[PDB]
What does this fold into?
Amino acid sequence: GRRPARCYRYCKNKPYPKSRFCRGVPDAKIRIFDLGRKKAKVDEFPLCGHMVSDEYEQLSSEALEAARICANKYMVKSCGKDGFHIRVRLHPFHVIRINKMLQTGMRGAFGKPQGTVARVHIGQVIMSIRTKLQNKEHVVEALRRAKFKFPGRQKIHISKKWGFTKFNADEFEDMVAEKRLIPDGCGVKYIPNRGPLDKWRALHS
Amino acid sequence: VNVPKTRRTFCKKCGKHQPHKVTQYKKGKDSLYAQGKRRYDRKQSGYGGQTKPIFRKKAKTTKKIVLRLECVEPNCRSKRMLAIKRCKHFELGGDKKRKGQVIQ
Amino acid sequence: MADKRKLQGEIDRCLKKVSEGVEQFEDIWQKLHNAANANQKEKYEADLKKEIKKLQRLRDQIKTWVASNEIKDKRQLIDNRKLIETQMERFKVVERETKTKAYSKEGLGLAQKVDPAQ
Amino acid sequence: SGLLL
RNA sequence: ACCAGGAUGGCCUAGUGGUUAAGGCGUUGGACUUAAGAUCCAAUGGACAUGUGUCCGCGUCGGUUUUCGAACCCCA
RNA sequence: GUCGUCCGACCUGGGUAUAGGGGCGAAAGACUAAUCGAACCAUCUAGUAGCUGGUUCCCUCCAAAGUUUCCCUCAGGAUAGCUGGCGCUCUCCGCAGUUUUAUCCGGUAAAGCGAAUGAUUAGAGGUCUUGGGGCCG
RNA sequence: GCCUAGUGGGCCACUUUUGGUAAGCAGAACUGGCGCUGCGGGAUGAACCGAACGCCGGGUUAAGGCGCCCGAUGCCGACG
RNA sequence: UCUGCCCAGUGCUCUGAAUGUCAAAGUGAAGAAAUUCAAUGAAGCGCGGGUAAACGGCGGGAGUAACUAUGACUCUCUUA
RNA sequence: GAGUUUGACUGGGGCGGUACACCUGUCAAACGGUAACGCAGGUGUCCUAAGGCGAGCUCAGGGAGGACAGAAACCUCCCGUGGAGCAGAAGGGCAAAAGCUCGCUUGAUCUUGAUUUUCAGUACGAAUACAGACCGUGAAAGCGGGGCCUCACGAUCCUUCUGACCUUUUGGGUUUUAAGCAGGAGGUGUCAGAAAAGUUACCACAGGGAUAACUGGCUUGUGGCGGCCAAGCGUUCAUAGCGACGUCGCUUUUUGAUCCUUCGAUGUCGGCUCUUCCUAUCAUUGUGAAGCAGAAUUCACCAAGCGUUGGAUUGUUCAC
Ligand SMILES: [Mg+2]
Ligand SMILES: [Mg+2]
Ligand SMILES: [Mg+2]
Ligand SMILES: [Mg+2]
Ligand SMILES: [Mg+2]
Ligand SMILES: [Mg+2]
Ligand SMILES: [Mg+2]
Ligand SMILES: [Mg+2]
Ligand SMILES: [Mg+2]
Ligand SMILES: [Mg+2]
Ligand SMILES: [Mg+2]
Ligand SMILES: [Mg+2]
Ligand SMILES: [Mg+2]
Ligand SMILES: [Mg+2]
Ligand SMILES: [Mg+2]
Ligand SMILES: [Mg+2]
Ligand SMILES: [Mg+2]
Ligand SMILES: [Mg+2]
Ligand SMILES: [Mg+2]
Ligand SMILES: [Mg+2]
Ligand SMILES: [Mg+2]
Ligand SMILES: [Mg+2]
Ligand SMILES: [Mg+2]
Ligand SMILES: [Mg+2]
Ligand SMILES: [Mg+2]
Ligand SMILES: [Mg+2]
Ligand SMILES: [Mg+2]
Ligand SMILES: [Mg+2]
Ligand SMILES: [Mg+2]
Ligand SMILES: [Mg+2]
Ligand SMILES: [Mg+2]
Ligand SMILES: [Mg+2]
Ligand SMILES: [Mg+2]
Ligand SMILES: [Mg+2]
Ligand SMILES: [Zn+2]
It folds into this structure.
């Protein structure tokens, strides 16, 4: 069917997204990028752990679905059915090709679109899970199990931030208290001291 | 394309823009006593077969349009020709096109 | 080349076949114009079906050759396709005038039948 | 005889 | 695989240049007959295989899909 | 050795007839003096070959190209480039595969998508700007 | 400034780079090499490292080495 | 013992002033003439028959019988 | 019956295709240049205006209204950086415009030179500034010698046509003719430009390992074999034996890919015979583990010492 991932592990080609120049691309195996309680608030799941890549390599969409199934199954087993939120932070955009050979040889050997594969850098987050603080070993074992679906070396890093936000978990709560972050669904909205004063009055009423 | 049958343009005999009548240029009849024709006939007479190339590999679908512009002044009446770009369909003085009209 | 001279031979054969096609079409045309009984009307009707359908396959090969970029002068093909269309539209007029029933929706909507000399 | 053809 | 095509009422086929949806069989309703076929008087129906582009407007033209058939796949 | 035929479209000697794009063929392109899908001899002829092979003493000095364009061009030429030789005109200001000081040029790496285009994940906040519905009319 | 031979099959490597699953694969850029060139070193070796060559003596080096082959630690070498 | 069907095609053959094309020679006219124009107009092509023990060729898709199959049957497209 | 021809490129050649003449975006590594049968596309046309000038407007789309009128007919207001249009492919460019609507037109005319582009610094094509006429248009400044730019095309020989009170028509003169000079066309798309169908298993020559059909070498997609993770199977029970979704490898007993060696020749399938080697072990020795009670069978380890047969069919390897 499809080749093993060692054929397309390395980022050898230029990026090749599906567009008006690449047509006849099959849909990615991964479709859902968020699992668990998507509707959980920002103060309910403070602890965030990342699976961070350590190589400039290419992760297949099949692997990105296998790892999210593995991590999802362990988190529904360990944290219960809804006690977590998984965000896969790679979307497979780079199309990989195939020159199928049943004879022409390398004449006209430009591939048809075989599959979709995401590109990850050294230090880029592959998977993130936010959850309560007591589920830390469950997060670490979930990413450690989901590691085996992926080629190359991944680290597990408990982030300094508060869930799926760009703000640090220590400064987070009192800067919510000072009305610098208004919680808005999954994350927060930053309120700077720069808008019209009617927004400040509406926030400080 | 469509060109009209009258054009007011330069005349080398008049040294001046004058009205011209416009006709399509027709390839004239080959005279038997042009020098190349006489040489061709006496080279083709006798034995030997065909002595000049016969062009077959025809690739153009279109001939360049040539207009015989003839000055209308009776003293001058001078003819010259103006070559326009290639076109499959050519019309001389057909109809000025109209804008914003109903199609039928 | 032999490929071009091949293509030209099938053009001349097809245009010949269209030539006798239109001639036999106008033959059965004037026989139906002179037809006496009803059964004669439906038989030369059926013969006009046969000839115009033969002619429609011939126009289909002509239009494929007109779409081709291997032919440089297409005035014979365009005139033959026009002649085929002329016969097709005349046949369409005849099949309308014969297949419309006297008291169908078309007849009860507009009877007409001007019959020029009358 | 004949070789590889 | 490459080239060339083909997808339209229930079945079998028409159909352009671009405006008209055509025909046969079938189905349906009424006549004829004791009744049924045959015959006579009529009626309906079309994912125009899909979406996109051109155009005022496409079943029709032009590129991409989805099912099909035809030809070729040679020298060792 | 084993075999086909061995009274007949049989075998055979001598004589004779047909000659090379011709003969002759119960037909295999067979035979035509060990030669046949066009015999042999001499000449035209030292035929032509963008293709293989070879190309004869020493020392000294300089020292490449496989690139551009055109060609029925792709195992070859022409053309420019590189090279050598012959010099010559001056020198005994000029120039540089280099930097600096000035000054323009660029849209690649990176970055961006709370910026245009395109792709795309998730919640949130709103109302009628429409719709799909339960329930009260 | 003139005349001008040979050439007009190239190949390899750092970095950039296209097709290909990849290839001692096919195709480009930059520069350097090999071809055209020996020498020291990489046991061996077209291209790697050092370095380019008249015939010799002394000295010294580069890159490599210094148990023995095999010149050089046969240092009472250092720390693991 | 039989040797079916097809003359649409390609061949072969028959017919010819009723004839589209039709060279040379001949004929009419214009001009100074070379020359030009025209009328005529052979065979053959075209046109019309005949020939397959001439070369050769000789279909597709549906529905259909008291289980189911099958399809004698019907419908349609289609050719020489 | 004779003579001749029967393109080229090309991951061998043929089939296919045109990368053969051109154009856009990319490749292309921020001057320029830059390759492949690299990628996504286009061209051989179209236009009496869609050329030229002047004037007036402003487009796509959205909101809100208004008889029939509705989603969509038309009238009106507002917002509207262009999200429209400019003949087409794409890119660039463009808002009192380069778009749309009118008005007038024919610079889409004649004639030298210079330049850019491809470039050899040659032509063609295309283009750019000028200059000399003669015009158009506007009040004028100006603008225009085709199309907003980047593409839309063609030598010699021949033919044809146009030009001049033109030259020659060879002893002189006149007239027809004919040949010249200059400028267009008729065209070579294999697009710097022969006039051209096949077959050869009856074949021939010069060559080529620049180039295919074996082995060998690089590679391992595919084939084969083996891991890791563990959702599930196994009455239960992840892991006795397995094992999905994924992922890492090995090997050259499969087919490919490539074309490095050999075309002044390395004898091309099978089988028979005979020797040796490997282990990914079917059996036998010694063992461990089973959902191993015995028997039988699995899984695994040291292990290649010794064995692994007789036949029907098929040329078979394979198969049964
Ligand atoms: Mg690549
Ligand atoms: Mg003669
Ligand atoms: Mg005999
Ligand atoms: Mg034979
Ligand atoms: Mg050659
Ligand atoms: Mg050679
Ligand atoms: Mg660029
Ligand atoms: Mg980047
Ligand atoms: Mg290479
Ligand atoms: Mg090579
Ligand atoms: Mg050499
Ligand atoms: Mg050198
Ligand atoms: Mg050296
Ligand atoms: Mg070594
Ligand atoms: Mg170095
Ligand atoms: Mg020394
Ligand atoms: Mg040593
Ligand atoms: Mg018979
Ligand atoms: Mg016949
Ligand atoms: Mg036959
Ligand atoms: Mg070739
Ligand atoms: Mg650069
Ligand atoms: Mg204006
Ligand atoms: Mg001027
Ligand atoms: Mg314009
Ligand atoms: Mg010539
Ligand atoms: Mg044979
Ligand atoms: Mg080789
Ligand atoms: Mg494999
Ligand atoms: Mg279970
Ligand atoms: Mg040898
Ligand atoms: Mg030998
Ligand atoms: Mg041997
Ligand atoms: Mg073992
Ligand atoms: Zn005049």
About this structure: Chains C and A do not touch (no CB pair under 8 Å).
